[PDB]
Write an enzyme that holds these catalytic residues in place. Sequence first.
Site, PDB file in Angstrom:
ATOM      1  N   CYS A 262      -2.177   8.688   3.148  1.00 45.41           N
ATOM      2  CA  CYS A 262      -2.265   7.943   1.692  1.00 45.41           C
ATOM      3  C   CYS A 262      -3.354   8.261   1.150  1.00 45.41           C
ATOM      4  O   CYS A 262      -3.900   8.414  -0.053  1.00 45.41           O
ATOM      5  CB  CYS A 262      -2.116   6.634   1.989  1.00 45.41           C
ATOM      6  SG  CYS A 262      -3.120   5.640   2.849  1.00 45.41           S
TER       7      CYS A 262
ATOM      8  N   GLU B 294       0.818  -1.383   0.072  1.00 46.16           N
ATOM      9  CA  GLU B 294      -0.062  -0.238   0.105  1.00 46.16           C
ATOM     10  C   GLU B 294       1.060   1.160  -0.197  1.00 46.16           C
ATOM     11  O   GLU B 294       1.527   1.529   1.065  1.00 46.16           O
ATOM     12  CB  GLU B 294      -0.947  -0.003   1.158  1.00 46.16           C
ATOM     13  CG  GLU B 294      -1.953   1.131   1.009  1.00 46.16           C
ATOM     14  CD  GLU B 294      -1.726   2.355   1.972  1.00 46.16           C
ATOM     15  OE1 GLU B 294      -1.133   3.356   1.523  1.00 46.16           O
ATOM     16  OE2 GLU B 294      -1.830   1.888   3.214  1.00 46.16           O
TER      17      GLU B 294
END
Lengths: 453, 453
Positions: free
Chosen positions: B261, B227
């Site tokens: 993120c 990720e």
Amino acid sequence: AIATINPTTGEICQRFKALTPAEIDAKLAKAQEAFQAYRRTSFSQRRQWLENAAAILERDTSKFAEIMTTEMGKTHQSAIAEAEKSALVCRYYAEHGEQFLANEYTETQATESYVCYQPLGILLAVMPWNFPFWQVFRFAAPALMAGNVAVLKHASNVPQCALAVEAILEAAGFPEGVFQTLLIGASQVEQVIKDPRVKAATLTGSEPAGASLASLAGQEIKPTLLELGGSDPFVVFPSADLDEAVEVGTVARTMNNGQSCIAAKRFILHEAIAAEFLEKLHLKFASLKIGDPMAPETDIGPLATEGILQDISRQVDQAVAAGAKILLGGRPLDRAGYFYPPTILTEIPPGAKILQEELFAPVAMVFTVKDLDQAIALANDIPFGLGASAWTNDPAEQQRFIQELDAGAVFINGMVKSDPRLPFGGTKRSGYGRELGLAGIRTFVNAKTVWLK
Amino acid sequence: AIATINPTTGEICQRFKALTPAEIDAKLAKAQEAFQAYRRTSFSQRRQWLENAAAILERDTSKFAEIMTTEMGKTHQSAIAEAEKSALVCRYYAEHGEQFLANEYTETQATESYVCYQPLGILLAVMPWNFPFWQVFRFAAPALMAGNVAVLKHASNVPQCALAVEAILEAAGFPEGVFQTLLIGASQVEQVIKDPRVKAATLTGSEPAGASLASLAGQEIKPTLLELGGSDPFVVFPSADLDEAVEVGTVARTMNNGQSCIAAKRFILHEAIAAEFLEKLHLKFASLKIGDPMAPETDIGPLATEGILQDISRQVDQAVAAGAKILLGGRPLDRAGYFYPPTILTEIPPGAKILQEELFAPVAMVFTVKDLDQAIALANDIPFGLGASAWTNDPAEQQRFIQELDAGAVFINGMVKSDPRLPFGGTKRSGYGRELGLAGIRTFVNAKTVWLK
Ligand SMILES: NC(=O)C1=CN([C@@H]2O[C@H](COP(=O)(O)OP(=O)(O)OC[C@H]3O[C@@H](n4cnc5c(N)ncnc54)[C@H](OP(=O)(O)O)[C@@H]3O)[C@@H](O)[C@H]2O)C=CC1
Ligand SMILES: NC(=O)C1=CN([C@@H]2O[C@H](COP(=O)(O)OP(=O)(O)OC[C@H]3O[C@@H](n4cnc5c(N)ncnc54)[C@H](OP(=O)(O)O)[C@@H]3O)[C@@H](O)[C@H]2O)C=CC1
């Protein structure tokens, strides 16, 4: 080189020109354009085209089988079965794919919250010569049902098979660019993995090939699935149906001329039954018919290439020099074509390199053990972890084998087989990820979480 | 260097000695021994220890939050929320993990055929400083419930957080070697990935870190989950609740001092509402409170490191030099600590490099579009593909955004958030694989197919 070289005769039949980098680029551009339209097709269209492909495979089975046999030497009868199995996986995803990709709802404070499943885009598949139709359809059926498009880099020795798969899919009705065969060599794959339009990759084959592809894909932040061979144990315990185990074990080791990731490669025999089992295995192997794979009576055709023949010949020679005993076979045949006989090796010394290698040929290693713990330890004492077969009618033993064998698949009282209905894949150095079943169509999709207030 | 350096003051608080390769090896040997016993524990034991860990997090929330704030600068209030969310994911897998890993039966000609789920062994997790508890517990809870063991390489600037996570798990009752924090630098991770006992790896962080880990893991035939960053769009259309969109968008961009993120990074405004929305966003950003993150009234603490501060400063300076306009903020604050103010950039020239970069700081890029097609094209015109948020009350628009935004998560009329109940992960250069939900506990297990005659 990219060529049809008949392994039964050694004859070079046809040569093919490799694509240039510019030609590869053009195919990727076409795949991207095709994907933009194909991702919008209905499941009904995809299902129609997949079912059409199945019907083509089911009608012209013998013709497709002849191509496989000519190029890579598996028996025509087993190649017929391979074409049939290819049709089966097409029908499996036609029949289940939409359901397998349906929205999955999860209750939250959202008015609507769920996961939906959408295609990634262009998938690269790097495939091996040993199941030149089945390995391709195993990947392509769920890929295409999910709305991905695919580019295939097949093995350099099965170009006619590779072209035939594309032709089947064209005839079935899949739009141009949805599936493309790339007649390219191993050195040309890096360009494909590095292309920004290519979103994921799968490889079935050798460890070095898998390592190359996966390391490159990792650098590019792209997901992979690898299935890389095995040294599967075939464990036979005292309550086993011995005659069934011998017959099935013989098939498991020698099917596809031994060239299967899930061949029974290491026979692990409980000392109570080892003498009887081994004698019967020896006799069964000695009765196998070696010869032209186009003949229906043939059990064992040639190995697929001169390199495969050279590899097993050396592996066996070195094991024997180290002290292993040849019960049967153990030397290439003195005849035209890449023939190696069914072989049984016993009394392999501890530390022999062959104990850790994959024997991709009809060569059985045989071991004796004294109890369940020893069987499990030996079965797992390899870098691979693909399949495992164990033979026993004691429920407690069955459960221990199922639980403790370090493999992606454990079969009790049967040989390991792949089946579209069940996921299939390796662990350890045999790879990761699962094909077939639900897993096969979930691997290369965007599982998109959706939350609506 | 491995050290606590308080980003509010710039003070070096504590330094830590990195492990040597021999010390790393010893920890891996212990993890392997621990795994051999831990894989045999019952779900009841694992559940007890996970619930104990949750209870520790729930009791000492403020203390753990203080460690996070001291090391990496997020507000104490948001760090309290982070500790609570960490407890939540522990409880989620305690409550659902066994069910999620239960045998799944499929009908065949076998007497018994099913898939069971077994742990792989040692998992490596490489984690970032931005959610120094939550990112760890997100991985560790399902890993441990599944029977894996884990080694953590945390960011070099959160050693106290890294040690605290291990201490929580020890206090909870998890046996020694089941979870170990490795105080090691980035250059030391290769040894871990290459160790034969380490079976899989996950990384959350930057693309270069992910590419390094995944390429190494690929070479070793080991599965990964990545990720990486995002540049998530926040799309606002004419039927949106504008005031809610402004409030929520401000939180989405500025939470965790912008260092998420899934921050809203690119605001894409329909021209019909753009003037009103932008003015309101300007006003909301202008009155955010910047200061000591330990103070309950603070909205914006310092960025976590001097490097992050230098990076955003340069990114913004270059965009402005290219012609981008500063509506608010746009330069580091003249005070102690790594402070950068809420900033809004508009009229960013086409081809400006910043359009393709992740802004890991409270800096919003703003764009105007004329219709749905233009919004979707701009939203997707990035290398990343993590989350996306869209605001509209037209059902047809909602469905198009859900279908066509190229992201792992699409939120309609709310900000993107991770939630243990739903899988979470990226696409494109944001990574692959899914954490949380069912997916989180299925990622690093052997899905073993079992067939019993
Ligand atoms: N898992 C399985 O089912 C199989 C495993 N094997 C194992 O590997 C051994 C050697 O067989 P071999 O035929 O050499 O197998 P390979 O792994 O070389 O071939 C498999 C596929 O990978 C391609 N390939 C090879 N190297 C690379 C690379 N660096 N990057 C990208 N693609 C690559 C091959 O292309 P090209 O043909 O152009 O070289 C072919 O398409 C066998 O004895 C067996 O042990 C092999 C085949 C099947
Ligand atoms: N997806 C996310 O949530 C995050 C994304 N980022 C993005 O990355 C940018 C830079 O942040 P930065 O702090 O440098 O993030 P990094 O990617 O450098 O750090 C993340 C983790 O990876 C480790 N690491 C770094 N390089 C390697 C390597 N080659 N091999 C193995 N591990 C490695 C780091 O260790 P060490 O600290 O020892 O270097 C840390 O544990 C941010 O501005 C943001 O854009 C960063 C953090 C969170």
